[PDB]
């Protein structure tokens, strides 16, 4: 008696909020934060879908989603550390040299 539509709507709201944070912020740290928000929203959507059908598949896909999320957070934060080490700023618009 909790609708699947409401859970999917909540996950979609969090996904588009994470996408908005990923786009509008020039800071690479806030871009990684937005990426974490989007992948957590997708994992929440999988949990909602699995709970609607009464299957463990949603939680299995949640586990795979957070394994991916942890690994990409590690890789992105290492890249952010290298960028801050060799540029002393996190402005992602500064790294735009290759073009055309």
């Amino acid at each position: 008696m909790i609708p699947l539509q409401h859970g999917l709507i909540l996950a979609a709201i969090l996904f588009v909020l994470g996408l908005t944070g990923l786009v509008i912020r020039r800071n690479l740290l806030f871009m990684l934060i937005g990426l974490e928000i989007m992948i957590n929203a997708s994992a929440l959507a999988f949990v909602v879908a699995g709970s609607y059908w009464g299957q463990t598949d949603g939680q299995v896909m949640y586990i795979l989603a957070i394994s991916l999320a942890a690994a990409e957070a590690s890789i992105g934060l290492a890249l952010l550390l290298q960028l801050h080490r060799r540029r002393q700023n996190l402005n992602i618009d500064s790294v735009s040299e290759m073009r055309g």
Binding site: T20, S51, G54, L64, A69, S74, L77
Partner: protein, 160 residues
């Protein structure tokens, strides 16, 4: 169980909205931790007990710990002195685009058959049964994915 789900969803939405509009990185990470706790409450309201447990243990206990560690490393610096994302000429366009995509996805959601989520609690025993049953290779190649992330992050995140 309905009330807990809706209040946790509302808290997660408000906390994410405060995350993507804040200036202080530690404050943004704190509202992100609050949003992760709220989404874990959503998971617990839907009977996904293992998913909410992992949401606090791993997502809100390891990943955002790593984010907080890196933010303390940076000692965050030409960020609050700009505030460019709150000027409308930067954020109106992407907000319009995200609103359009949200409208399209919500319209697609509203045209589905719904029998309602009964919220029957799915334990971690069943998740472990199906994890080492139908999804053996998922576990093994996810170990390899974590290994790949470990090797990549060690190779990049050094100092020499």
């Amino acid at each position: 169980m309905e009330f807990a789900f809706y209040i946790c969803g509302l808290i997660a939405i408000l906390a994410t909205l405060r995350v993507i509009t804040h200036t202080n990185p530690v404050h943004a990470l704190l509202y992100l931790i609050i949003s992760l706790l709220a989404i874990s409450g959503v998971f617990f309201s839907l009977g996904a007990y293992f998913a909410g447990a992992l949401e606090i243990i791993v997502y809100a206990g390891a990943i955002m710990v790593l984010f907080v560690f890196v933010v303390m490393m940076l000692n965050l610096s030409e960020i609050e002195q700009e505030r460019q994302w709150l000027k409308p000429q930067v954020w109106i366009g992407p907000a319009i685009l995200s609103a359009i995509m949200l409208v399209v996805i919500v319209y697609a959601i509203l045209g589905v058959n719904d029998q309602g989520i009964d919220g029957t609690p799915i334990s971690a025993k069943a998740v472990g049964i199906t994890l080492f049953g139908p999804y053996v290779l998922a576990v093994e190649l996810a170990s390899m994915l974590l290994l790949a992330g470990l090797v990549v992050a060690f190779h990049v995140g050094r100092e020499e």
